[PDB]
Design a protein around this nucleic acid. Structure first.
Ligand SMILES: [K+]
Lengths: 31, 100, 157, 120, 49, 246, 238
RNA sequence: CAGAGUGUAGCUUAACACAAAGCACCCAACUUACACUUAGGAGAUUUCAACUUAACUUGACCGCUCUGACCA
């Protein structure tokens, strides 16, 4: 399954906050 | 912000469940590789008895296997009639050069 | 002592691989592939890093030698979009592409099918898998471009 | 006044002791031994024992290691063992488990250092 | 440099058993090692390899 | 000149052709564990154990004690697993272990240990102290009947005798209070001997106390075959051993 | 020749089109991971601008000093409002398609999250049976080459399959049920080869009675007990 | 469906009893990652009856592995 290694967090000590967004591709599919 | 006792207790209990859930993911993935490997090896042994020449070709490497490219799944499927906006892509990657 | 039956009880250097102070690529045999590069490209750094970690750990479980695990240089791409009722392109978003490579060797001819099936099923969404054969060009692509050598080489041309 | 086994300076651990505390940690259990330099075990406390296991939620955590120290310290006093050496590795000594086991032994009365031999 | 006391030889405390530039022989029970890797007896007894 | 080994040499079963594919230790702890195992095995070359290890007799030690108790492992294992489930089910137990605030009751541990592993731990400890070597010329027994000896010191205190704990001659001036679990109609003999007290003869002992034909556990009603004598370890002679044998 | 007839089957698989839904525990862990990530992160540029903007709005109230405040024209929350409006206007593709509600087991569009296997119905001895596409081995051809040929024999198919390796991933050995059971023709031996459906699909001429695309769970409805036991070993459902 | 063999969680010729053990394994932190270390997690005798003993012996009962029937 795609969830095998998809539950993650930024493994850095110093990093700015990141926000989840949907990247709409050119065929309409999203990720 | 300091976490409350109830929160730290809820996070500790959730992670304890995560160890067992991931332990069962690996087991399913570890029993699938075994099943596939056994069936393949069993089939290859049966293919050697039937015809040795075909078995020799079966165990050879496939030159056309690589390069092997596969994209991951999408979140939502493609839209049949979706028109993307017009735009341009401008690569702004810094080029590093070694001097001396 | 030499004459005694216990001669050589303290030998140990035949049990260790010799250490030698770039690296020759070993082309695969008829039944085993050569050095293989497993590229993992994703628009999200955490997904590529997480899957590269999964593939490394999976290869350890399967006794597949991992020659090297390294990251390729990140590529930043500006995404301009034509404005409404206008001919000017305005900067919309900046998308970075992060790539991770898990370099393996010694993959078997028969087991290659099973290995590829497992590492594609666990592929996260938005992560691209590309299994290529290692070449000198792949290794050289990791190093800075030398402009001085190009100018001096151009004179010879 | 008894001889301690001096020497073995190039290997680990030392033999220069009369009694030593030796802790064995496995995947499921925690065992602590007090043994004489000649190799004889004097007293022991293990989470494999039902007397200890029945009171422990887990026999493999820090609490189990602290409990083994408290049980062993009492058994040491009943056997007459008041002194012993403990020979941990750098990572073992820094571990929170071993620090709690050592505190349990010292609070229980056992001294984890041995007196110097008298030569004269 | 070499063995000064062979197998079975009686030694006294302090007697140098062997001298070596490298650790050919290692110190055992009741055997000290000097700053220059010199092996000497810490007790009176019989040398054993 | 060379001589063939008298047996299998170390590091011989290692296949040197597949060295790169062989598993390595990777940790100091994994090598040490294997190293300690090899050191204990018998070898055909000269070893430290040969010259310094005590020369134990090859024949096993004759057992002269009471028969082991018969226990149903199946029922015992079932009850033990059930108890662990009940303890682990309690949520307050999990938080105490997770927060490292839990503790065991030492009083209960000793009571259970005295019923279960106590006898074997006492035998192992008695063998270390040399009692079986001296008292029974090497024959060993499992002390399956717990013996509780206590010297009354003052009017409100007791000095318990365990298995090697130090008791001073002043505390042992009078006969101790001896109590053990015994059925009705049984007979017992209790003695006290000083293994090391004897002044003239090295191999002999001193009989400090002898009580015979004790009915049940009523030690006071036994026949005083030998009256009680307090220990008299001589000055400068070291630490002596006094053993109560039931 | 040999008594056993050599056959080459093809296990053509359509890999998941969309990601699989998160389970209840995975959702809890995903929320915790998001919370931890926010907790240990530094302030983002957006957060800083919102803070400064709120601060600069305060000083204007306290003191009439303007300081241009060009960027203050649009606030950080005002931008967030515009971003959400455009999102609510876009309609995402349906992860559950019409074929999932109609239950059309002949279309690829159904069951996007799970893997599908191709099953073609073939008539043996006046009896219809569901089997993986197969062809008979012929001299001068590798055993995999027989599987590559099965696609060409498929009826009005425009599909490009990627074959993984040369070795077979399974086998099923059966004997004819006494019909044409002879020393020359004792039975058959099918060898399965896995392939991935890169792109393409069948035509609209003949769809229903020909083929179906089924997940591994609903794979037994069509295959036989013994034929199923051998197919459920190399068909993964990870 | 029949005939044989077979029986501790993944492996073990671990289990005398004092006890279901050792390793392998899963998560987290450290590590680019791996490894190591620390701190946690999950586990088994197929089920009953026979000196009551018995994970161990004999029987049935279950699961398993092959050999045939059944088979496209
Ligand atoms: K004496």
């Amino acid at each position: 399954d795609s969830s095998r290694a998809s539950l993650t967090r930024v493994h850095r000590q110093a990093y700015a906050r990141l926000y989840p967004v949907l990247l709409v591709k050119q065929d309409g599919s999203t990720i | 912000v300091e976490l409350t006792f109830e929160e730290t207790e809820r996070r500790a209990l959730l992670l304890k469940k995560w160890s067992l859930y991931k332990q069962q993911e690996r087991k399913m993935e570890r029993d699938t590789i075994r099943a596939m490997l056994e069936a393949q090896q069993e089939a290859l042994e049966e293919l050697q008895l039937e015809s040795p020449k075909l078995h020799a070709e079966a165990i050879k490497r496939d030159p056309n296997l690589f390069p092997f490219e596969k994209e991951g799944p999408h979140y939502t499927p493609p839209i049949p009639n979706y028109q993307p906006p017009e735009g341009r892509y401008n690569d702004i990657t810094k080029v590093y050069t070694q001097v001396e | 002592y030499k004459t005694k039956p216990t001669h050589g009880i303290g030998k140990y250097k035949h049990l260790i691989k010799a250490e030698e102070p770039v690296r020759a690529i070993n082309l695969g045999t008829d039944y085993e592939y050569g050095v293989l590069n497993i590229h993992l490209t994703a628009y999200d750094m955490t997904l590529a890093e997480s899957y590269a970690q999964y593939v490394h750990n999976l290869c350890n479980s399967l006794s597949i030698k991992v020659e090297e695990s390294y990251a390729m240089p990140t590529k930043t791409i500006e995404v301009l979009q034509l404005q409404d009722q206008g001919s000017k392109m305005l900067l919309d978003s900046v998308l970075t592409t992060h790539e991770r490579v898990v370099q393996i060797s010694g993959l078997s001819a028969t087991f290659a099918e099973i290995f590829l099936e497992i590492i594609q099923s666990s592929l996260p969404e938005g992560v691209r898998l590309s299994v290529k054969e290692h070449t000198e060009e792949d290794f050289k692509g990791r190093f800075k471009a030398r402009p001085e050598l190009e100018e001096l080489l151009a004179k010879l041309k | 006044v008894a001889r301690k086994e001096r020497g073995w300076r190039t290997v680990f651990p030392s033999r220069e002791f009369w009694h030593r505390l030796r802790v064995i940690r496995t995947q499921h259990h925690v065992e602590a031994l007090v043994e004489h330099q000649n190799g004889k075990v004097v007293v022991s406390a293990s989470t494999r024992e039902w007397a200890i296991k029945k009171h422990l939620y887990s026999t493999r955590n820090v609490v189990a290691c602290e409990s083994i120290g408290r049980v062993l310290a009492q058994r040491c006093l009943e056997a007459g063992i008041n002194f012993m050496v403990y020979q941990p590795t750098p990572w073992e000594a820094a571990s929170d488990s071993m620090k709690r086991l050592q505190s349990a032994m010292t609070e229980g009365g056992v001294v984890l250092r041995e007196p110097q031999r008298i030569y004269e | 440099q070499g063995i000064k006391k062979m197998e079975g030889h009686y030694v006294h405390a302090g007697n140098i058993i062997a001298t070596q530039r490298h650790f050919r022989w290692h110190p055992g029970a009741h055997v000290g090692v000097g700053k220059n890797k010199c092996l000497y007896a810490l007790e009176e007894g019989i040398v054993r390899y | 000149r060379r001589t063939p080994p008298l047996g299998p040499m170390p590091n011989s079963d290692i296949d040197l052709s597949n060295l790169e594919r062989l598993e390595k230790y990777r940790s100091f702890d994994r090598y040490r564990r294997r190293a300690e195992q090899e050191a204990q095995a018998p070898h055909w070359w000269r070893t430290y154990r040969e010259y310094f290890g005590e020369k134990t007799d090859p024949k096993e030690k004759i057992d002269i004690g009471l028969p082991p108790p018969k226990v149903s492992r199946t029922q015992q294992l079932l009850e033990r697993k059930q108890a662990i489930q009940e303890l682990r089910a309690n949520v307050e137990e999990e938080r105490a272990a997770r927060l490292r605030t839990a503790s065991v009751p030492l009083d209960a541990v000793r009571a259970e240990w005295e019923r279960t592993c106590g006898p074997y731990h006492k035998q192992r400890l008695a063998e270390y102290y040399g009692l079986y070597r001296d008292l029974f010329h090497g024959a060993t027994f499992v002390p399956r009947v717990p013996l509780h000896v206590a010297y009354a010191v003052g009017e409100d205190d007791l000095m318990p005798v365990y298995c090697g704990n130090e008791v001073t001659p002043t505390e042992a001036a009078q006969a101790p209070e001896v109590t053990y679990e015994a059925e009705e109609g049984s007979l017992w003999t209790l003695l006290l001997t000083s293994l090391d007290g004897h002044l003239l003869e090295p191999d002999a002992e001193y009989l400090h106390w002898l009580l015979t034909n004790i009915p049940g556990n009523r030690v006071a009603e036994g026949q005083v075959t030998c009256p009680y004598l307090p220990p008299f370890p001589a000055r400068g002679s070291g630490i002596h051993r006094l053993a109560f044998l039931l | 020749g040999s008594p056993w007839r050599l056959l080459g089957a093809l296990c053509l698989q359509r890999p998941p089109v969309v990601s699989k839904p998160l389970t209840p525990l995975q959702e809890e862990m995903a929320s915790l991971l998001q919370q931890i990530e926010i907790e240990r992160s530094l302030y983002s540029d957006h957060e800083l601008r919102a803070l400064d903007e709120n601060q600069r709005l305060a000083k204007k109230k306290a003191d009439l000093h303007d300081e241009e405040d060009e960027q203050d024209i649009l606030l950080a929350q005002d931008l967030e409002d515009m971003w959400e409006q455009k999102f609510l206007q876009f309609k995402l593709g349906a992860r559950i398609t019409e074929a999932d509600e109609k239950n059309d087991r002949t279309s690829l569009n159904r069951k996007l999250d799970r893997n599908l296997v191709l099953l073609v119905r073939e008539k043996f001895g006046d009896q219809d049976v569901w089997i993986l596409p197969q062809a008979e081995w012929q001299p001068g051809e590798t055993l995999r080459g027989t599987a590559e040929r099965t696609l060409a024999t498929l009826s009005e198919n425009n599909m490009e399959a990627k074959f993984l390796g040369n070795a077979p991933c399974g086998h099923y050995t059966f004997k004819f049920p006494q019909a044409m059971r002879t020393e020359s023709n004792l039975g058959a031996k099918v060898f399965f080869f896995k392939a991935l459906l890169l792109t393409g699909d069948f035509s609209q001429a003949g769809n229903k009675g020909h083929h179906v695309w089924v997940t591994k769970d609903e794979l037994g409805d069509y295959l036989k007990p013994k034929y199923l036991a051998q197919v459920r070993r190399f068909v993964s459902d990870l």
